[PDB]
């Protein structure tokens, strides 16, 4: 399989990001339940929270208050930012190669 590395890694980052979103949702709820006042405690809204966290939006409607909930959050942020950054890098590599040919 000799397809462009930048597109492979971009695909890998996307799949991995989806995994992080699902795992993040699960682990956040597991971490936040048991803490009085915590709102990140049911899976559907936890997945929504993971999405806005990975994109860095966030709104402030949901967020973790525990140590482990916040650690999970940081992993989600980094994975999200890295993934989108890897797509941008792949796009640049594409454009650069095509401009040489042009």
């Amino acid at each position, epitope marked *: 399989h000799g397809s462009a590395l930048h597109w492979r890694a971009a695909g890998a980052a996307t799949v991995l990001l989806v995994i992080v979103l699902l795992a993040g949702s699960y682990l956040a709820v597991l971490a936040e339940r048991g803490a009085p006042g915590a709102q990140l405690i049911t899976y*559907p809204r936890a997945l929504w929270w993971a999405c806005e966290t990975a994109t860095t939006v966030x709104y402030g409607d949901l967020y973790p208050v525990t140590l482990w909930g916040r650690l999970v959050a940081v992993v989600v942020m980094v994975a999200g930012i890295t993934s989108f950054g890897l797509v941008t890098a792949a796009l640049a590599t594409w454009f650069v190669g095509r401009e040489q040919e042009r």
Partner: antibody
Amino acid sequence: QVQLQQPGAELVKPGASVKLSCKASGYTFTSDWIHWVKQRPGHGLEWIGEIIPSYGRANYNEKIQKKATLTADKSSSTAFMQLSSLTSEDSAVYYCARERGDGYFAVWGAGTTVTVSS
Amino acid sequence: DILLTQSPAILSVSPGERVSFSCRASQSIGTDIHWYQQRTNGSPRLLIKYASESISGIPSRFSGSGSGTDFTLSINSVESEDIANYYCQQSNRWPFTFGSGTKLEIKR
């Protein structure tokens, strides 16, 4: 078919301890929580605690004194509640309930009537 | 923790009328309220989830409404099998809590 099976009754001597059971049936997911609810005669529902079988973590009501200890067994799909050092205050019906991690109690057990007496 | 207040504790109504149970939270909880029915010597049974969402198997005369702090469970044309205790439950913040309950009465 009956999703949550609980024994009908348990007789406990004052100061002793009992281990209640809740046997699960039907669809079981990784995101399932088993809750325990205490109801004294002629009174309302009181939330005791919760456990997630797929991970084993348990949380408890902090407003009340901790009398309970939640464990689970994935093999037998059974959740357990360990009530210890019981008095007459602890005499009640104890329901187990299943929550799909979306906030509500979809199904309840028939409840185990716990009587504490000598 | 979130306090849910159900007042009054007893509702008396003539057979066929529309009844409304009240549930008030000590703080805003969106629509994260669920309703349960418990008959004499029975286990609680889910009637309405997320304030207004209906459940399969539950008679269409049962409905729910409200958001924020004030929630209502309604029965269109009360009949004898509706005689029970009615509880609300919130899942907005940990820990989940229950209301104190409202008993339904029928003046036959």
